Amino acid sequence: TTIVGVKFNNGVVIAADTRSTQGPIVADKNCAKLHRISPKIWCAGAGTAADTEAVTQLIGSNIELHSLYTSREPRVVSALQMLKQHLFKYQGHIGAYLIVAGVDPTGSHLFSIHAHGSTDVGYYLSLGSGSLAAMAVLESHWKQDLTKEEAIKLASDAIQAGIWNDLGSGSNVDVCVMEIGKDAEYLRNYLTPNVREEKQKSYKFPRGTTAVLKESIVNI
């Protein structure tokens, strides 16, 4: 997996690839990895995938409840605190590693959370098996006060580096742009650099090729 977060002059952009693998096999070529904790708080996780899903679901539900209770837009730090306390309570057995980015009345925030409950502030972050390849590009090309377009290009290209140079990362690039003044822009399959090679032949079988012993109609 390859995630990157990139803060820019007026927001933060979080990007990820879409390949999902079980063992050395590509279980899904177009897995969506960016998850809403809120309309303007988005996360993407590594490690035990099921734990990332369950924990993000829990935190999103609790945060929407709290936002309704307080009648205030969620703070990114609220999600950070709740997530890190929950992960710490289990002493890392939840195994959820996340990059959480979002926008709130206090500004644009980019954090990372580790399974044992430690967190980090950052201006550019990377995660997953492709973390090193993406971080190489981020280090080479990141600068203070990137524009939104430069930020999107930089995040997309770091994810592309992870895609090209890591086996556990591939297919398409998902991008989500959070900006201070307006709604988040989720860009599903922002880049599609890995279109499918065409079949040399159509391997459809003539009907009747299979041998059938019995046939029945099921009363559903």
């Binding site: 809403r36 809120s38 309309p39 303007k40 679901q57 829990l58 539900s61 929407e64 409840l65 309704l68 209770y69 989500c176 709604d183 988040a184 822009e185 989720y186 860009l187 599903r188």
Partner: protein, 241 residues
């Protein structure tokens, strides 16, 4: 809370009396939406009435209004939100339909009606909501936990007059804006004091509102169907009235 010799639950009738002492609240079903309305009283001219909304969101498709004791409504509402998330959405990945959430709220209020050491809630709710399967819905939930669906209904001190007015006005072919017009007229006829966009408040369960979704780029997600009408939106209609 125990049966009296006549078979009535003793303290529930007192909760109903407390509800009757509450301010008028309304609900009207159009063919393409639902309106819920209520007047909001003020403790003093200095109090910021805009701080408190008697209408509240339970789920992006469900909204609630009440007549009776306000604090009871507030605690019942956050209990309702908690159950709607923990008990249904945490499992099925979707918000409970109006029928299911109404049932859970009725259960919450009925537990107090069937448990010692606690008095029943002193609020009657009108829970408007929408479903992909049941369609639009409007339910009145009483202190006893008894809930029944209504085409249009009114609760509070103006209950009987508002009900007799709705019985005249309601018809099977109302659109949402006609329902809003009827609700405005009915609630104006029941408000004894000043009537303007700040004393009245409205909410509608209508078509999708992607402008309120807060994010873009997901075609599948639709956005809240519940939305409150701002003071200016209500003033516009009262001026056009």
């Amino acid at each position: 809370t125990t049966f009296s010799p006549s078979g009535k639950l003793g303290q529930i009738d007192y909760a109903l009396t407390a509800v009757k002492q509450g301010v008028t609240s309304l609900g009207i079903k159009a063919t393409n939406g639902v309106v819920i309305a209520t007047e909001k009283k003020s403790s003093s001219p200095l109090a910021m009435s805009e701080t408190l909304s008697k209408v509240s969101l339970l789920t992006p498709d469900i909204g609630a209004v009440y007549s009776g004791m306000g604090p009871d409504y507030r605690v019942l509402v956050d209990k309702s939100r908690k159950v709607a998330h923990t008990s249904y959405k945490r499992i099925y990945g979707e918000y409970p339909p109006t029928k299911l959430l109404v049932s859970e709220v009725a259960k919450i209020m009925q537990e107090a009606t069937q448990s010692g050491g606690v008095r029943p809630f002193g609020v009657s709710l009108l829970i408007a909501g929408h479903d992909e399967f049941n369609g639009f819905s409007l339910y009145q939930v009483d202190p006893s936990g008894s809930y029944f669906p209504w085409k249009a209904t009114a609760i509070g001190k103006g209950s009987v007059a508002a009900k007799t007015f709705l019985e005249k006005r309601w018809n099977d072919e109302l659109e949402l804006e006609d329902a809003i017009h009827i609700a405005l007229l009915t609630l104006k006829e029941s408000v004894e004091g000043e009537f303007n966009g700040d004393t009245i408040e409205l909410a509608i369960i209508g078509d999708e509102n992607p402008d309120l979704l807060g994010y873009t780029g997901i075609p599948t997600d639709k956005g809240p169907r519940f939305r409150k009408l701002t003071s200016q939106e209500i003033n516009d209609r009262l001026e056009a009235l």
